Ligand binder design. Structure first.
Ligand SMILES: Nc1nc2c(ncn2[C@@H]2O[C@H](COP(=O)(O)OP(=O)(O)O)[C@@H](O)[C@H]2O)c(=O)[nH]1
Ligand SMILES: Nc1nc2c(ncn2[C@@H]2O[C@H](COP(=O)(O)OP(=O)(O)O)[C@@H](O)[C@H]2O)c(=O)[nH]1
Ligand SMILES: [Mg+2]
Lengths: 217, 280, 151, 292, 95
């Protein structure tokens, strides 16, 4: 493992999420998958330690020229709030070289309040290759479509961040969709269950209000 | 750099003025409100000297009410504002957005931007860039918007950025703000992103400092506030109404040594700031 | 506890120069007189012979002097140094170190069996032996501050 | 050292707002979400390190108020040290409030007549600024005439609201009537003021930030204690954002705010601006074990 | 006239860059404080030797008592008398 100093930068300099100094620790080539774990042995949950995957990219010319330590720079916004670390802290770096073996199995997505075609989903998934994502990251397609990565799965574990490869089964769940209900009105609707409730009474008192409350939540 | 506040009646210009400036170039001067109702504009009714005397024009749009006519009136204002002087920075504030979701706020801002761009395309104006800010009185947004508006009217911005970057790099400072004594409008900072939580901490530190000083008067403001984890918050009044607020982390060092080196470095920075006429 | 007024008056009195009458030998007053701690080197009390900038510069000089004294206090090699004057007053042993700071003669002495330091700074024309005698007789009169530790 | 405090009033008088802001660390804007207190809500609060405060947030609604003086009269009003009756100036049934207060005074005189009655005219921010003092005096004359009838020769009142700092002063003077060894604290604070040569030294509590005692008991603001309490509460709520706790604050090397102990916060204003910080901090640290 | 303003702006850029460089040159870090090397142990004889080094054999040959014995003791007494510093009061006060 390696050691690096954490840094933050605004969107004016660079648009990438995580940037590291390529001139320091030159074991890492420009195109790699690099862990950003903040723990060196004995991981702590109460203290707060996370393993955030990302893809290596070099510093901006303006930032590298007018530099002030900070071997690794994280773009502000959502990733900084997820990591929750001060402006100068101690982090660690690995060089996991198995991109194929570290592919996430299922990456979720949300397409709320916008119509994506099936081919649009295919194109958006094609653009999301060799790029690492994390939970609740607002991806953008055509500068108007908004996404939300609500779940990354790998070997039965819901990892906070994962790597999306060629063989990643990325799904596109819809948070704003057309729904059709087909209620059967039969002779059994006025029948009574063993507790003492009619089935249509259940339908109008416990299924629909709960599903509307859940949909609103 | 006198900024002009324009908007429809009951949009919130007077309340914004009260909240900000009541609680030249850089100081918080007496800004000019302007109630602009829907009408036909008189051609050159001795308003050329007024708009030539405005450093940057600020427009206020109420997000609660219908705003298409507001955008149309704004386009009519810009149609002669850019013609009279092509060096005026034009700012638009989307006020009263406290009770809206993030998605609704972004969609409203995008719709306002598209409508303003299309209306300026219809009027034939080219080479004009209009900034948009989502502002509200109840939070920090109006302060940050006015900070950006003021920063657009200081020609010595990059040199102050370099000076603060050097000061932070040689004093173990986490984040240093060059505030002003009134309105809590921070004038310059480093290349580090402006954290909202740290900005609110520094603003309430300014309020606590000014109030505690005002409680004991009638006998150069300096303040050191150290927390439990060793993190200190420093204050030192600069030239004219400017005040420097910095958050310095000890990094496992002596508190008094850090205070001494920070005091000497900040005094050197103030001596350097004496040469440049950034005050007032 | 401590009293700032009496310590300030004591430091102001130790800023007095020397005027010898049998031999015409006038000496200037000390540049600065102050008392600093043995842990962080910050100024507890101070007094100048003759404003905020000078206070900050004196604090920086006190930090530098304490930083140089810290390594000398924890070193036992080359103990027979010509610039060390270890005096024992009232069965209390201490070590006095003299330093040269560009054009300023700085001499410090730890108050024995305590976490405090006594520092005298004068100009480059001031003799070192007179400084040693001055700080020895100053430490002779400071018996009430013996055995004082920071809270 | 258990002190039983009673917090009574009419419905919507803002008793729970006072309890939340003073003790439970809620903002003024966060009192709108508070529900209606059903029956009596007990709150065991530890003041300093030895005192505990048994504050009884009574209901104040008509059924609860009628239940207090009929069936629970032998439980609510026994072994009571301080009554804090809260009056609302927005109420249109002021005579009913005075009659309820008279019944409470009668029960307290019947059971524990050694108590200390305090009245707070809450919600005195909706009324205009010109008539606040006149309305307070008009209601206070009637409340003192009523109070003197059912025993209790003295009755101290305060115009209070949650949108200013008078609540801190009122609760500080309510609490300080129960704090033991106040004379020793005053003597030690006077000794420390003489030793450090300070203009005025004020002693607070660390958690609630209420005034405990002052050195004095250039004209200064008579309402400076409550304003310093409000400013310190705001500064503590600001320093909670930095994931840490407030420890020290020095202003112009003349106003020293430091954690004197684990239960008190000192507020020292000196006279000479040339004293170095380390000497004042060392003298503060010497007195840290003295006030314990 | 605007070209004169352009030259004025170029002079402003040079002056402001000089102002930045000037205030940048006085920045002292804690590493500079810890490893300054300014505070060095100096004796009177070593200071005289360095003075002669910058300015630029057994000279002495081995061959009243009352006057020298009086004057040495009087000089020591006059040195010790003026070093007697009397406090204006107690240093530490009790409770
Ligand atoms: N919620 C909310 N209301 C606002 C805000 N700004 C202004 N207002 C409302 O606007 C009203 C005052 O408008 P005013 O400043 O007098 O309008 P003007 O005289 O035309 O500038 C108040 O009743 C406020 O409720 C805001 O940021 N948030
Ligand atoms: N405007 C204003 N409202 C107040 C004040 N004090 C309390 N309130 C209101 O009182 C409500 C809460 O009342 P509550 O404490 O539950 O009354 P209680 O149960 O009788 O003690 C909040 O919605 C506040 O708006 C005040 O000083 N000013
Ligand atoms: Mg209640």
């Amino acid at each position: 493992a390696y050691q690096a100093e954490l840094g933050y930068h605004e969107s004016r300099f660079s648009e990438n999420l995580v940037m590291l100094n390529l001139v320091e620790f030159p074991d890492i080539k420009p195109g790699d998958l690099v862990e950003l774990k903040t723990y060196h042995k004995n991981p702590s949950a109460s203290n707060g330690d996370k393993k955030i995957y990302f893809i290596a990219k070099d510093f901006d010319g303006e930032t590298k020229r007018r530099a002030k330590t900070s071997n690794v720079s994280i773009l502000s916004g959502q990733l900084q709030t997820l990591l929750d670390l001060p402006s100068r802290s101690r982090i660690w770096i690995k060089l996991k070289p198995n991109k194929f073996d570290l592919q996430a199995d299922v990456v979720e997505f949300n397409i709320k309040d916008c119509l994506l075609n099936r081919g649009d989903m295919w194109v958006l998934s094609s653009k999301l290759v060799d790029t690492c994502v994390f939970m609740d990251q607002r991806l953008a397609f055509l500068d108007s479509i908004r996404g939300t990565i609500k779940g990354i799965y790998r070997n039965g574990k819901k990892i906070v961040s994962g790597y999306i490869g060629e063989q990643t089964r990325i799904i596109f769940r819809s948070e704003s969709a057309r729904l059709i209900f087909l209620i059967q009105i039969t002779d059994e609707m006025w029948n009574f269950e063993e507790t003492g409730e009619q089935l249509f009474q259940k339908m109008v008192n416990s299924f629909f209000p709960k599903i509307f409350k859940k949909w609103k939540d | 750099a006198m900024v002009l506040l324009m908007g429809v009646r009951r949009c919130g210009k007077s309340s914004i003025c009260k909240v900000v400036f009541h609680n030249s170039t850089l100081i918080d001067l007496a800004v000019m409100e302007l109630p602009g109702q829907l009408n036909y504009f008189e051609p050159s009714y001795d308003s050329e000297r007024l708009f030539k005397s405005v450093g940057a024009l600020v427009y206020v749009i109420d997000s609660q009410d219908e705003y298409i006519n507001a955008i149309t009136n704004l386009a009519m204002i810009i149609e002669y504002a850019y013609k009279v002087n092509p060096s005026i920075n034009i700012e638009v504030l989307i006020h009263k957005v406290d009770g809206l979701s993030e998605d609704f706020k972004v969609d409203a801002q995008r719709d306002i931007m598209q409508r303003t761009g299309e209306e300026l395309l219809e009027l034939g104006l080219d080479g004009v860039q209009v900034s948009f800010y989502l502002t509200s009185i109840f939070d920090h947004s109006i302060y940050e918007a006015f900070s950006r508006i003021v920063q657009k009217l200081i020609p010595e911005l990059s040199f102050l950025e370099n000076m603060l970057d050097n000061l932070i790099q040689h004093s173990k400072i986490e984040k240093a703000f060059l505030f002003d004594v009134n309105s809590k409008i921070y004038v310059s900072t480093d290349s580090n992103p402006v954290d909202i939580q740290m900005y609110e901490v520094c603003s309430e530190f300014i309020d606590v400092t000014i109030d505690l000083f005002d409680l004991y008067k009638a006998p150069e403001l300096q303040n050191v506030s150290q927390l439990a984890n060793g993190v200190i918050i420093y204050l030192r009044q600069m030239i004219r109404g400017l005040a420097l607020v910095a958050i310095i982390r000890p990094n496992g060092t002596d508190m008094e040594s850090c205070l001494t080196v920070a005091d000497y470095n900040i005094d050197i920075f103030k001596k350097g700031l004496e040469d440049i006429w950034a005050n007032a | 506890m401590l009293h700032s007024k009496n310590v300030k008056g004591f430091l102001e009195n130790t800023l007095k120069p020397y005027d010898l009458h049998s031999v015409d030998f006038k000496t200037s007053s000390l540049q600065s007189s102050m008392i600093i701690t043995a842990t962080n080197g910050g100024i507890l009390s101070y007094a100048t012979s003759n404003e905020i900038n000078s206070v900050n510069n004196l604090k920086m000089m006190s930090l530098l002097i304490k930083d140089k004294w810290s390594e000398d206090e924890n070193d036992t090699e080359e103990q027979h140094s010509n610039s060390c004057y270890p005096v024992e007053i009232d069965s209390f042993k201490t070590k006095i170190y003299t330093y040269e700071m560009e054009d300023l003669h700085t001499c410090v002495a730890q108050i024995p069996n305590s976490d405090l330091l006594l520092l005298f700074i004068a100009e480059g024309s001031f003799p070192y032996g007179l400084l040693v005698i001055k700080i020895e007789r100053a430490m002779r009169e400071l018996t009430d501050l013996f055995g004082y530790k920071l809270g | 050292n258990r002190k039983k405090l009673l917090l009574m009033g009419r419905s919507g008088s803002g008793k729970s707002s006072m309890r939340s802001i003073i003790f439970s660390n809620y903002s003024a804007f966060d009192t709108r979400r508070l529900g209606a207190t059903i029956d009596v809500e007990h709150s065991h609060l530890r003041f300093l390190g030895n005192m505990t405060l048994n504050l009884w947030d009574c209901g104040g609604q008509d059924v609860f108020m009628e239940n207090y003086f009929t069936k629970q009269k032998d439980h609510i009003f026994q072994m009571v040290q301080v009554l804090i009756h809260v009056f609302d100036v927005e109420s249109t049934e002021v005579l009913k409030d005075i009659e309820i207060f008279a019944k409470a005074l009668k029960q307290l005189r019947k059971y524990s007549p050694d108590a200390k009655i305090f009245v707070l005219l809450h919600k005195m921010d909706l009324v205009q600024l010109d008539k606040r003092e006149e309305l307070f005096q008009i209601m206070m004359k009637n409340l003192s005439e009523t109070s003197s009838e059912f025993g209790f020769p003295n009755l101290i009142g305060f115009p209070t609201s949650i949108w200013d700092e008078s609540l801190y002063k009122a609760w500080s003077q309510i609490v300080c009537s129960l704090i033991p060894n106040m004379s020793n604290h005053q003597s030690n604070l006077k000794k420390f003021k003489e030793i450090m040569n300070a203009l005025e030294i004020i002693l607070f509590e660390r958690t609630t930030f209420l005034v405990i005692c002052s050195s004095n008991g250039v004209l200064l603001d008579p309402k400076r204690f409550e304003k310093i309490s409000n400013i310190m509460k705001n500064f503590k709520q600001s320093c909670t954002k930095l994931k840490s706790g407030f420890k020290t604050l020095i202003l112009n090397n003349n106003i020293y705010v430091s954690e004197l102990s684990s239960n008190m916060v000192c507020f020292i204003v000196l006279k000479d601006m040339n004293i170095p910080q380390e000497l004042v901090l060392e003298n503060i640290k010497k007195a840290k074990e003295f006030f314990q | 006239k605007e070209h004169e303003h352009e030259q004025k702006l170029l002079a402003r850029e040079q002056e402001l860059r000089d102002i930045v460089a000037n205030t940048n040159d006085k920045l002292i870090d804690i590493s500079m404080i810890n490893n300054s090397g300014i505070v060095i142990q100096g004796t009177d004889l070593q200071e005289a030797l360095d003075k002669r080094q910058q300015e630029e054999t057994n000279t002495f040959t081995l061959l009243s008592k009352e006057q020298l014995k009086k004057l040495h003791s009087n000089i020591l007494n006059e040195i010790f008398s003026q070093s007697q510093v009397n406090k204006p009061g107690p240093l530490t006060v009790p409770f």
